[PDB]
């Protein structure tokens with residue numbers, strides 16, 4: 357029958373590049389698309405094609421050739437001619453960034469999105485659950501979210517991850533707390549409050565053999581550990597810091613919160629095993645373990661058939677709502693170290 361609440365604004369629902377192999381699915385947010393192509397692809401004249409909300413139009417039209425050396429804007433107008441939305445569409449044609457100083461974020465947003473740059477060119481957007489937290493109605497400003505930027509880093513600014521209450525609305529959804537996280541991948545806001553573990557899509561293509569994840573942290577557990585909203589006395593919160601490498605396929609384009617450590621597609625895992633509460637910047641250097649009966653194939657590697665994810669969280673079991681509100685993980689000067697070829 358007739359739609360109950362018409363969604364007003366019209367969306368780009370998909371993106372593809374006819375005749376170019378994308379290295380992973382385009383990452384679509386409310387007002388942005390990131391398209392990934394192999395290093396060496398000519399990006400001076402790409403012609404993205406979109407699907408849209410029925411009855412919408414897009415300007416310039418779907419299939420217009422443009423120069424994506426810089427991001428290009430499109431406007432979608434709803435059928436009614438009143439509602440419009442601007443999207444920024446960017447093409448990433450470089451290999452994954454591996455040096456993270458947490459200085460750079462996207463301006464003009466209601467919460468922080470950390471990016472990696474080469475000069476003025478953005479080459480990666482980190483993801484978090486921020487889009488999901490916005491849906492609880494709790495945050496007022498960028499600093500109220502679980503994932504934000506803090507001025508006092510080890511050098512310059514740093515990443516700050518704080519486990520937050522999700523308030524009344526979060527509790528009625530069975531989601532009473534929100535861990536601060538940051539990861540390589542994307543956040544699918546359509547699952548944020550229906551299948552939250554499916555919302556965190558971990559990994560992007562990586563064409564080297566990672567050997568160590570290194571960097572610095574500080575950590576303070578929150579005062580009162582809770583399990584599904586219920587206080588528990590014997591427990592102190594702890595952070596998690598980890599990285600995974602897995603082989604992609606038609607059936608496994610990404611891993612997520614349901615299978616980050618268990619998917620048979622995993623080839624390698626690095627993970628902190630001596631995390632502690634500390635107010636001093638503490639070095640970690642996590643070796644990647646290649647898993648039993650797995651191997652990194654050279655030709656798959658060069659073809660881009662493996663993804664790597666790096667994940668930080670202020671509450672190790674926060675993804676299952678076990679954690680302490682106020683748990684705070686600061687991260688700075690991280691490096692993904694890989695073998696020289």
Ligand SMILES: C[As](C)(=O)[O-]
Nearest residue numbers: 385386387388465
């Ligand atoms: C960061 As947005 C307004 O494209 O979801």
Ligand SMILES: C[As](C)(=O)[O-]
Nearest residue numbers: 365438439440441
């Ligand atoms: C109705 As409008 C502000 O999306 O042009």
Ligand SMILES: [Ca+2]
Nearest residue numbers: 439440441442
């Ligand atoms: Ca608008």
Ligand SMILES: [Ca+2]
Nearest residue numbers: 457509511513
């Ligand atoms: Ca820094």
Ligand code: NA
Nearest residue numbers: 363365366367
């Ligand atoms: Na919309």
Ligand code: NA
Nearest residue numbers: 453455456472
């Ligand atoms: Na960087």
